Design a protein that fits this description.
With 178 residues, the protein is mostly helical. It has two domains: 1-59, Zinc/RING finger domain, C3HC4 (zinc finger) (Herpes Virus-1); 60-178, Bromodomain-like (Histone Acetyltransferase, Chain A). It contains seven helices and two strands; from the N terminus they run ββααααααα. The chain has helices at residues 43-53, 63-67, 73-87, 93-96, 115-123, 130-148, 154-171; strands at residues 14-16, 23-25. The protein has a two-stranded antiparallel sheet. α1 crosses α3 (73-87) and α3 runs antiparallel to α7 (154-171). The radius of gyration is 17 Å and the shape is globular. Bound molecules: zinc ion (3 copies). One zinc ion is lined by residues 17, 19-20, 22, 41-42, 44-45. The PDB classes it as transcription. Keywords: PanDDA, bromodomain, epigenetics, XChemExplorer, transcription. The assembly is monomeric.
Length: 178
């Protein structure tokens, strides 16, 4: 197995996947690495298994249909994985914890949002449809773009949104378009 966490790229107290060479800190993995369970399979392995069991699940889909899906176990897992893929980018640090807004010439958002809040919301089964999760994720970046206006720091929101969107299209097998 790897000797660094797949998500944050640091060593420490790591839990090793039994079915691939990846390793994780406890709370870097999503869901948090399960207490017992030998063997243990990581979220990358669990997603791969879904795909292998239903090869047709990789045919293209319409985003509108994906968003209306109820958060049954497989959709719950796909959203957990998509959230984890965002945390895998180091630029996710800017969006992880609760933000505050005090900048001359800007007003903070009506509905603040951040990655750890989405993480808790998933853990607590607060989303009933995929749409709920995707709306909160997109809100994170939209709030950032709006608040930072013309400051070049706005680009961090663009960059992390692009990682989110690319992974959304891959995980949920959204039909390719120009
Ligand atoms: Zn980690
Ligand atoms: Zn694995
Ligand atoms: Zn089948």
């Amino acid at each position: 197995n790897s000797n660094i966490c797949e998500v944050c790229n640091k060593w420490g107290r790591l839990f090793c996947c039994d079915t691939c060479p990846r390793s994780f800190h406890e709370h870097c993995h999503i869901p948090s690495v399960e207490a017992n369970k030998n063997p243990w399979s990581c979220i990358f392995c669990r997603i791969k298994t879904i795909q292998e069991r239903c090869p047709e699940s990789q045919s293209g889909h319409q985003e509108s249909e994906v968003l209306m899906r109820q958060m049954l176990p497989e959709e719950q897992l796909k959203c957990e994985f998509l959230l984890l893929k965002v945390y895998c980018d180091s630029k996710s640090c800017f969006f992880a914890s609760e933000p505050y807004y005090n900048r001359e010439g800007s007003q903070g958002p009506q509905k603040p949002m951040w990655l750890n809040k989405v993480k808790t919301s998933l853990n607590e089964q607060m989303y009933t449809r995929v749409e709920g999760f995707v709306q909160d994720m997109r809100l994170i970046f939209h709030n950032h773009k709006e608040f930072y206006r013309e400051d070049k720091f706005t680009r961090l929101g663009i960059q992390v949104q692009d990682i989110f969107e690319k992974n959304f299209r891959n995980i949920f097998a959204i039909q390719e378009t120009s």
